[PDB]
Amino acid sequence: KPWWEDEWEVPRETLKLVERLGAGQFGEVWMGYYNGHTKVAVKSLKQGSMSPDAFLAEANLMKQLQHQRLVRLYAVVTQEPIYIITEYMENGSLVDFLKTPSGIKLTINKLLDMAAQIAEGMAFIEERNYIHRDLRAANILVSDTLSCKIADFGLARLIEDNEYTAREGAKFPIKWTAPEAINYGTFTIKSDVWSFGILLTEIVTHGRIPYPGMTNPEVIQNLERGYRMVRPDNCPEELYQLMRLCWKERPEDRPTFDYLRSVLEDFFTAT
Ligand SMILES: Cc1cccc(Cl)c1Nc1nc2ccc(N3CCN[C@@H](C)C3)cc2n2cncc12
């Protein structure tokens, strides 16, 4: 739909950037205000750094996937510099939150709580025929009420025919990404279920890196033997067995996101 007609397009005067949160090869991420009053987060694309079309394909995807457990597109400014304006998450990224004095003191109870909200997010992604493909603590954001939401939809995709096969010179974080996706580039909701498994190790160890003290060739080599990640320090056995289902060998055997959600919900009231 054209920019002079798109419900999401906002004139650039409505926006005021107050505090750079991040900078990288492709642009900055700011905290600012929409029409004076509403905290928003603003992503600006660095001109020249990659295609406006590719940068905006992210917003368009978020036009289709709206949910309370997913970070909400708030508006776009489709003239240069292009802006993606989304809903603002106060406690920032999960990987970072878990490390702060506030996060340090959270009981295992609340960690299960949190792990359940992230699965609810995914159950809706799964249900609408989308995949995430980049599911990891660094991509869960946390709200001023200590609730969580799936963020970053740069790699997310719609999937009528069950699979998305990626480019072939194409690399993904080895520790978070399922065997089949690393080996064939074939992704399914079941490869996200795998990363969810890794993500639960981040939640429980307060953000520490998966597979403590192993390189990536050690990690691939170990998985091929039939090994899985060594039990995290202070990891309830239920949690660990739950991660094991996420780490099953065949995609089809790995559990649904609705099943994970509910399992995590039982783990939580039990505490
Ligand atoms: C701007 C944008 C574009 C595309 C997709 C999303 Cl989910 C978002 N929203 C956010 N993107 C962020 C990207 C990075 C960071 N951080 C930079 C690295 N370190 C911490 C402080 C968070 C925070 C974001 N955010 C917060 N509240 C909302 C957001």
mmCIF file of C-alpha atoms and ligand atoms in Angstrom:
data_model
loop_
_atom_site.group_PDB
_atom_site.id
_atom_site.type_symbol
_atom_site.label_atom_id
_atom_site.label_comp_id
_atom_site.label_asym_id
_atom_site.label_seq_id
_atom_site.Cartn_x
_atom_site.Cartn_y
_atom_site.Cartn_z
ATOM 1 C CA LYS A 1 0.000 0.000 0.000
ATOM 2 C CA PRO A 2 1.515 3.357 -0.901
ATOM 3 C CA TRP A 3 3.175 5.563 1.698
ATOM 4 C CA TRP A 4 0.482 8.399 1.328
ATOM 5 C CA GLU A 5 -2.069 5.821 2.402
ATOM 6 C CA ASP A 6 -0.344 3.460 4.842
ATOM 7 C CA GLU A 7 -1.905 3.540 8.416
ATOM 8 C CA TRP A 8 1.713 3.039 9.773
ATOM 9 C CA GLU A 9 3.559 5.862 7.947
ATOM 10 C CA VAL A 10 4.149 8.882 10.281
ATOM 11 C CA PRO A 11 5.553 12.339 9.276
ATOM 12 C CA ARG A 12 9.096 12.638 10.706
ATOM 13 C CA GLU A 13 8.267 15.691 12.862
ATOM 14 C CA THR A 14 6.241 13.500 15.272
ATOM 15 C CA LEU A 15 9.458 11.915 16.528
ATOM 16 C CA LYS A 16 12.156 13.068 18.886
ATOM 17 C CA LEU A 17 15.304 10.950 19.496
ATOM 18 C CA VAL A 18 16.565 11.387 23.056
ATOM 19 C CA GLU A 19 19.210 8.607 23.793
ATOM 20 C CA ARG A 20 21.275 6.342 21.486
ATOM 21 C CA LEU A 21 20.945 2.795 22.810
ATOM 22 C CA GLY A 22 23.089 1.122 20.061
ATOM 23 C CA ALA A 23 25.157 1.686 16.839
ATOM 24 C CA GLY A 24 26.475 -0.807 14.260
ATOM 25 C CA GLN A 25 27.433 -1.323 10.615
ATOM 26 C CA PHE A 26 23.808 -0.809 9.461
ATOM 27 C CA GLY A 27 22.544 2.041 11.770
ATOM 28 C CA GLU A 28 21.550 3.244 15.243
ATOM 29 C CA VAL A 29 18.826 2.323 17.835
ATOM 30 C CA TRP A 30 17.398 5.240 19.790
ATOM 31 C CA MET A 31 14.944 5.932 22.610
ATOM 32 C CA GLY A 32 12.713 8.899 21.825
ATOM 33 C CA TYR A 33 9.184 10.235 22.001
ATOM 34 C CA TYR A 34 6.306 10.157 19.642
ATOM 35 C CA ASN A 35 4.237 13.380 19.776
ATOM 36 C CA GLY A 36 5.997 14.387 23.095
ATOM 37 C CA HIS A 37 4.444 11.793 25.318
ATOM 38 C CA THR A 38 4.825 8.135 24.215
ATOM 39 C CA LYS A 39 8.151 6.362 24.727
ATOM 40 C CA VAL A 40 9.071 4.607 21.407
ATOM 41 C CA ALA A 41 12.208 2.942 20.158
ATOM 42 C CA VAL A 42 13.588 4.185 16.869
ATOM 43 C CA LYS A 43 15.767 2.161 14.431
ATOM 44 C CA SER A 44 17.448 4.281 11.741
ATOM 45 C CA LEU A 45 19.114 2.764 8.747
ATOM 46 C CA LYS A 46 22.515 3.967 7.776
ATOM 47 C CA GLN A 47 22.326 5.083 4.061
ATOM 48 C CA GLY A 48 24.452 2.909 1.767
ATOM 49 C CA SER A 49 24.837 0.211 4.356
ATOM 50 C CA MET A 50 22.169 -2.214 2.957
ATOM 51 C CA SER A 51 19.002 -2.054 0.806
ATOM 52 C CA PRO A 52 16.022 0.140 1.969
ATOM 53 C CA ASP A 53 13.847 -2.627 0.636
ATOM 54 C CA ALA A 54 15.537 -5.211 2.901
ATOM 55 C CA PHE A 55 15.477 -2.988 5.929
ATOM 56 C CA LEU A 56 11.695 -2.391 5.371
ATOM 57 C CA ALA A 57 10.756 -6.041 4.640
ATOM 58 C CA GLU A 58 11.176 -6.303 8.477
ATOM 59 C CA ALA A 59 8.388 -3.717 9.174
ATOM 60 C CA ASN A 60 6.019 -5.297 6.582
ATOM 61 C CA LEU A 61 6.449 -8.665 8.354
ATOM 62 C CA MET A 62 5.574 -6.985 11.704
ATOM 63 C CA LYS A 63 2.471 -5.477 9.899
ATOM 64 C CA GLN A 64 1.228 -9.172 9.730
ATOM 65 C CA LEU A 65 2.280 -10.463 13.154
ATOM 66 C CA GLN A 66 0.628 -8.501 15.901
ATOM 67 C CA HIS A 67 0.340 -9.973 19.412
ATOM 68 C CA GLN A 68 0.826 -8.965 23.070
ATOM 69 C CA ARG A 69 3.830 -11.368 23.335
ATOM 70 C CA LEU A 70 5.433 -9.863 20.217
ATOM 71 C CA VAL A 71 7.135 -6.386 20.040
ATOM 72 C CA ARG A 72 4.686 -4.115 18.134
ATOM 73 C CA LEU A 73 5.449 -2.125 15.081
ATOM 74 C CA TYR A 74 4.379 1.409 15.857
ATOM 75 C CA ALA A 75 5.174 3.195 12.541
ATOM 76 C CA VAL A 76 7.623 3.682 9.695
ATOM 77 C CA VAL A 77 9.114 6.667 8.056
ATOM 78 C CA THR A 78 9.712 5.595 4.487
ATOM 79 C CA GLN A 79 11.896 8.565 3.383
ATOM 80 C CA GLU A 80 15.660 8.990 3.956
ATOM 81 C CA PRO A 81 16.764 8.066 6.678
ATOM 82 C CA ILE A 82 14.163 5.311 6.903
ATOM 83 C CA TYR A 83 12.877 4.815 10.441
ATOM 84 C CA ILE A 84 11.300 1.727 12.054
ATOM 85 C CA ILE A 85 9.456 2.845 15.123
ATOM 86 C CA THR A 86 8.348 0.216 17.565
ATOM 87 C CA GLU A 87 6.975 -0.283 21.078
ATOM 88 C CA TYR A 88 9.494 0.504 23.841
ATOM 89 C CA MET A 89 10.849 -2.090 26.204
ATOM 90 C CA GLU A 90 12.089 -0.618 29.398
ATOM 91 C CA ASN A 91 14.305 -3.296 30.814
ATOM 92 C CA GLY A 92 15.924 -3.850 27.548
ATOM 93 C CA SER A 93 17.334 -7.065 26.295
ATOM 94 C CA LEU A 94 16.849 -10.313 28.350
ATOM 95 C CA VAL A 95 20.517 -11.328 28.061
ATOM 96 C CA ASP A 96 21.361 -7.887 29.639
ATOM 97 C CA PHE A 97 18.502 -7.679 32.175
ATOM 98 C CA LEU A 98 19.364 -10.998 33.804
ATOM 99 C CA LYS A 99 22.817 -9.597 34.739
ATOM 100 C CA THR A 100 21.650 -6.405 36.451
ATOM 101 C CA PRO A 101 21.156 -6.196 40.332
ATOM 102 C CA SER A 102 17.428 -6.484 39.670
ATOM 103 C CA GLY A 103 17.723 -9.692 37.510
ATOM 104 C CA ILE A 104 20.296 -11.338 39.812
ATOM 105 C CA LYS A 105 17.698 -11.475 42.602
ATOM 106 C CA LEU A 106 14.912 -13.228 40.595
ATOM 107 C CA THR A 107 13.737 -16.610 41.959
ATOM 108 C CA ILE A 108 13.616 -19.642 39.721
ATOM 109 C CA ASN A 109 9.812 -19.146 39.873
ATOM 110 C CA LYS A 110 9.951 -15.903 37.883
ATOM 111 C CA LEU A 111 12.456 -17.405 35.436
ATOM 112 C CA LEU A 112 9.874 -20.156 34.613
ATOM 113 C CA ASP A 113 7.243 -17.425 34.396
ATOM 114 C CA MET A 114 9.405 -15.569 31.934
ATOM 115 C CA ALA A 115 10.291 -18.795 29.954
ATOM 116 C CA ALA A 116 6.553 -19.425 29.599
ATOM 117 C CA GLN A 117 5.763 -15.960 28.143
ATOM 118 C CA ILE A 118 8.411 -16.452 25.488
ATOM 119 C CA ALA A 119 6.845 -19.806 24.518
ATOM 120 C CA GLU A 120 3.391 -18.145 24.269
ATOM 121 C CA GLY A 121 4.930 -15.663 21.835
ATOM 122 C CA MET A 122 6.283 -18.469 19.713
ATOM 123 C CA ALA A 123 2.983 -20.490 19.877
ATOM 124 C CA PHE A 124 1.351 -17.578 17.899
ATOM 125 C CA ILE A 125 4.246 -17.349 15.477
ATOM 126 C CA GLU A 126 3.954 -21.144 14.979
ATOM 127 C CA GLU A 127 0.181 -20.909 14.566
ATOM 128 C CA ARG A 128 0.302 -18.197 11.795
ATOM 129 C CA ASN A 129 2.745 -20.178 9.653
ATOM 130 C CA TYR A 130 5.791 -18.090 10.463
ATOM 131 C CA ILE A 131 9.275 -18.980 11.678
ATOM 132 C CA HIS A 132 11.638 -16.799 13.705
ATOM 133 C CA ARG A 133 15.095 -18.229 12.904
ATOM 134 C CA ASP A 134 17.009 -15.989 15.442
ATOM 135 C CA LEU A 135 15.416 -16.996 18.749
ATOM 136 C CA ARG A 136 17.765 -16.306 21.654
ATOM 137 C CA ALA A 137 17.935 -14.303 24.922
ATOM 138 C CA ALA A 138 19.517 -11.235 23.067
ATOM 139 C CA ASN A 139 16.287 -11.100 20.984
ATOM 140 C CA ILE A 140 13.771 -11.254 23.895
ATOM 141 C CA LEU A 141 13.060 -7.730 25.312
ATOM 142 C CA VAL A 142 11.808 -7.020 28.807
ATOM 143 C CA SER A 143 9.137 -4.542 29.870
ATOM 144 C CA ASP A 144 9.057 -2.260 32.902
ATOM 145 C CA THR A 145 6.648 -4.872 34.566
ATOM 146 C CA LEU A 146 9.137 -7.669 34.083
ATOM 147 C CA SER A 147 7.238 -9.294 31.200
ATOM 148 C CA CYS A 148 8.914 -10.568 27.974
ATOM 149 C CA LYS A 149 8.158 -10.206 24.196
ATOM 150 C CA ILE A 150 9.713 -11.789 21.036
ATOM 151 C CA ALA A 151 11.721 -9.116 19.195
ATOM 152 C CA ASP A 152 13.768 -8.767 15.987
ATOM 153 C CA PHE A 153 12.128 -10.099 12.952
ATOM 154 C CA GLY A 154 14.975 -9.606 10.468
ATOM 155 C CA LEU A 155 15.129 -13.279 9.639
ATOM 156 C CA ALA A 156 11.441 -14.223 10.269
ATOM 157 C CA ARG A 157 9.494 -15.714 7.331
ATOM 158 C CA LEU A 158 6.049 -16.884 6.178
ATOM 159 C CA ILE A 159 5.906 -20.540 5.126
ATOM 160 C CA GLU A 160 2.934 -21.971 3.119
ATOM 161 C CA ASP A 161 5.055 -24.976 1.907
ATOM 162 C CA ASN A 162 6.424 -26.247 5.146
ATOM 163 C CA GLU A 163 10.108 -25.315 4.762
ATOM 164 C CA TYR A 164 12.261 -22.284 4.210
ATOM 165 C CA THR A 165 15.616 -23.174 2.618
ATOM 166 C CA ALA A 166 18.026 -20.191 3.064
ATOM 167 C CA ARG A 167 20.785 -18.882 0.738
ATOM 168 C CA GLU A 168 23.722 -21.375 0.457
ATOM 169 C CA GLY A 169 26.746 -19.157 1.510
ATOM 170 C CA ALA A 170 24.724 -18.639 4.639
ATOM 171 C CA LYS A 171 25.900 -18.795 8.225
ATOM 172 C CA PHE A 172 23.963 -18.789 11.536
ATOM 173 C CA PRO A 173 25.193 -18.662 15.224
ATOM 174 C CA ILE A 174 26.264 -22.276 15.665
ATOM 175 C CA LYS A 175 25.247 -22.755 19.267
ATOM 176 C CA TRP A 176 21.656 -21.558 18.937
ATOM 177 C CA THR A 177 20.738 -22.983 15.553
ATOM 178 C CA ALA A 178 19.402 -26.562 15.022
ATOM 179 C CA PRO A 179 21.551 -29.311 13.175
ATOM 180 C CA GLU A 180 19.358 -29.379 10.021
ATOM 181 C CA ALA A 181 19.435 -25.635 9.585
ATOM 182 C CA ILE A 182 23.194 -25.419 9.918
ATOM 183 C CA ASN A 183 23.716 -28.477 7.709
ATOM 184 C CA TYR A 184 21.135 -28.024 4.869
ATOM 185 C CA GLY A 185 19.866 -24.493 5.417
ATOM 186 C CA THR A 186 16.360 -25.976 5.811
ATOM 187 C CA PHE A 187 14.430 -24.118 8.705
ATOM 188 C CA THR A 188 11.047 -25.021 10.224
ATOM 189 C CA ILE A 189 9.126 -24.007 13.369
ATOM 190 C CA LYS A 190 10.931 -27.102 14.779
ATOM 191 C CA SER A 191 14.324 -25.463 14.297
ATOM 192 C CA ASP A 192 13.079 -22.514 16.368
ATOM 193 C CA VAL A 193 11.999 -25.057 19.007
ATOM 194 C CA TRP A 194 15.626 -26.051 19.087
ATOM 195 C CA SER A 195 16.829 -22.513 19.795
ATOM 196 C CA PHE A 196 14.180 -22.221 22.461
ATOM 197 C CA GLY A 197 16.025 -25.107 24.043
ATOM 198 C CA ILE A 198 19.297 -23.133 24.015
ATOM 199 C CA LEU A 199 17.477 -20.020 25.180
ATOM 200 C CA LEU A 200 16.251 -21.814 28.301
ATOM 201 C CA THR A 201 19.933 -22.372 29.178
ATOM 202 C CA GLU A 202 20.514 -18.582 28.992
ATOM 203 C CA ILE A 203 17.436 -17.858 31.162
ATOM 204 C CA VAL A 204 18.546 -20.300 33.914
ATOM 205 C CA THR A 205 22.282 -19.402 34.048
ATOM 206 C CA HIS A 206 21.519 -15.653 34.025
ATOM 207 C CA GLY A 207 22.718 -15.021 30.560
ATOM 208 C CA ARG A 208 26.038 -17.040 30.469
ATOM 209 C CA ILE A 209 27.018 -18.377 26.875
ATOM 210 C CA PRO A 210 25.835 -21.884 25.907
ATOM 211 C CA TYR A 211 28.141 -24.955 25.996
ATOM 212 C CA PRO A 212 30.587 -23.486 28.653
ATOM 213 C CA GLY A 213 34.284 -23.755 27.388
ATOM 214 C CA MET A 214 33.613 -25.452 24.016
ATOM 215 C CA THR A 215 34.501 -24.021 20.602
ATOM 216 C CA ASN A 216 31.909 -24.511 17.768
ATOM 217 C CA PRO A 217 33.625 -27.601 16.186
ATOM 218 C CA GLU A 218 33.554 -29.178 19.683
ATOM 219 C CA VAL A 219 29.752 -28.382 19.899
ATOM 220 C CA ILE A 220 28.935 -29.859 16.384
ATOM 221 C CA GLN A 221 31.232 -32.850 17.047
ATOM 222 C CA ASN A 222 29.572 -33.496 20.431
ATOM 223 C CA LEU A 223 25.992 -33.271 19.083
ATOM 224 C CA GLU A 224 26.895 -35.800 16.356
ATOM 225 C CA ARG A 225 28.039 -38.258 18.998
ATOM 226 C CA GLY A 226 24.596 -38.010 20.409
ATOM 227 C CA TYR A 227 25.613 -35.649 23.303
ATOM 228 C CA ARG A 228 23.693 -32.591 24.479
ATOM 229 C CA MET A 229 24.672 -29.636 26.570
ATOM 230 C CA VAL A 230 25.973 -30.448 30.037
ATOM 231 C CA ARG A 231 23.401 -29.638 32.816
ATOM 232 C CA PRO A 232 23.670 -25.902 33.639
ATOM 233 C CA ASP A 233 24.692 -24.961 37.253
ATOM 234 C CA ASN A 234 21.485 -24.850 39.387
ATOM 235 C CA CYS A 235 19.170 -26.091 36.646
ATOM 236 C CA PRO A 236 16.029 -27.900 37.883
ATOM 237 C CA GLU A 237 16.002 -31.376 36.408
ATOM 238 C CA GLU A 238 12.486 -30.773 34.963
ATOM 239 C CA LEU A 239 13.818 -27.775 33.055
ATOM 240 C CA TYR A 240 16.723 -29.786 31.736
ATOM 241 C CA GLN A 241 14.507 -32.658 30.501
ATOM 242 C CA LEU A 242 12.299 -30.071 28.870
ATOM 243 C CA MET A 243 15.344 -28.699 26.984
ATOM 244 C CA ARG A 244 16.123 -32.283 25.982
ATOM 245 C CA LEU A 245 12.777 -32.572 24.050
ATOM 246 C CA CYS A 246 13.730 -29.323 22.265
ATOM 247 C CA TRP A 247 17.114 -31.034 21.387
ATOM 248 C CA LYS A 248 15.594 -34.281 19.936
ATOM 249 C CA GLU A 249 17.277 -35.524 16.758
ATOM 250 C CA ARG A 250 14.447 -35.422 14.294
ATOM 251 C CA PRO A 251 12.475 -32.164 13.729
ATOM 252 C CA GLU A 252 9.155 -34.077 13.827
ATOM 253 C CA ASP A 253 9.855 -35.485 17.335
ATOM 254 C CA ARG A 254 10.517 -32.112 18.815
ATOM 255 C CA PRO A 255 7.523 -30.720 20.744
ATOM 256 C CA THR A 256 5.101 -27.933 19.620
ATOM 257 C CA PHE A 257 5.269 -24.371 20.947
ATOM 258 C CA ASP A 258 1.819 -24.699 22.491
ATOM 259 C CA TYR A 259 3.004 -27.743 24.412
ATOM 260 C CA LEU A 260 6.149 -25.973 25.715
ATOM 261 C CA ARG A 261 4.032 -23.013 26.774
ATOM 262 C CA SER A 262 1.735 -25.130 28.853
ATOM 263 C CA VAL A 263 4.536 -27.255 30.296
ATOM 264 C CA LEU A 264 6.350 -24.084 31.363
ATOM 265 C CA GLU A 265 3.024 -22.806 32.876
ATOM 266 C CA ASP A 266 2.725 -25.950 35.112
ATOM 267 C CA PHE A 267 6.407 -25.611 36.145
ATOM 268 C CA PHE A 268 5.647 -22.047 37.262
ATOM 269 C CA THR A 269 2.522 -22.484 39.592
ATOM 270 C CA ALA A 270 4.104 -25.621 40.946
ATOM 271 C CA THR A 271 6.766 -23.122 42.288
HETATM 272 C C1 LIG B 1 13.620 -0.727 16.723
HETATM 273 C C2 LIG B 1 13.220 -2.132 16.308
HETATM 274 C C3 LIG B 1 13.353 -2.574 14.977
HETATM 275 C C4 LIG B 1 12.990 -3.855 14.578
HETATM 276 C C5 LIG B 1 12.458 -4.762 15.477
HETATM 277 C C6 LIG B 1 12.287 -4.435 16.819
HETATM 278 CL CL1 LIG B 1 11.604 -5.744 17.841
HETATM 279 C C7 LIG B 1 12.678 -3.067 17.341
HETATM 280 N N1 LIG B 1 12.562 -2.601 18.653
HETATM 281 C C8 LIG B 1 13.615 -2.527 19.559
HETATM 282 N N2 LIG B 1 14.889 -2.824 19.120
HETATM 283 C C9 LIG B 1 15.978 -2.807 19.955
HETATM 284 C C10 LIG B 1 17.266 -3.125 19.472
HETATM 285 C C11 LIG B 1 18.361 -3.085 20.348
HETATM 286 C C12 LIG B 1 18.217 -2.728 21.717
HETATM 287 N N3 LIG B 1 19.344 -2.713 22.587
HETATM 288 C C13 LIG B 1 20.686 -2.328 22.113
HETATM 289 C C14 LIG B 1 21.637 -3.344 22.726
HETATM 290 N N4 LIG B 1 21.548 -3.305 24.172
HETATM 291 C C15 LIG B 1 20.275 -3.121 24.895
HETATM 292 C C16 LIG B 1 20.206 -1.892 25.828
HETATM 293 C C17 LIG B 1 19.053 -3.129 23.970
HETATM 294 C C18 LIG B 1 16.933 -2.403 22.253
HETATM 295 C C19 LIG B 1 15.799 -2.425 21.414
HETATM 296 N N5 LIG B 1 14.502 -2.110 21.864
HETATM 297 C C20 LIG B 1 14.161 -1.755 23.119
HETATM 298 N N6 LIG B 1 12.817 -1.556 23.125
HETATM 299 C C21 LIG B 1 12.319 -1.791 21.872
HETATM 300 C C22 LIG B 1 13.432 -2.148 21.030
#
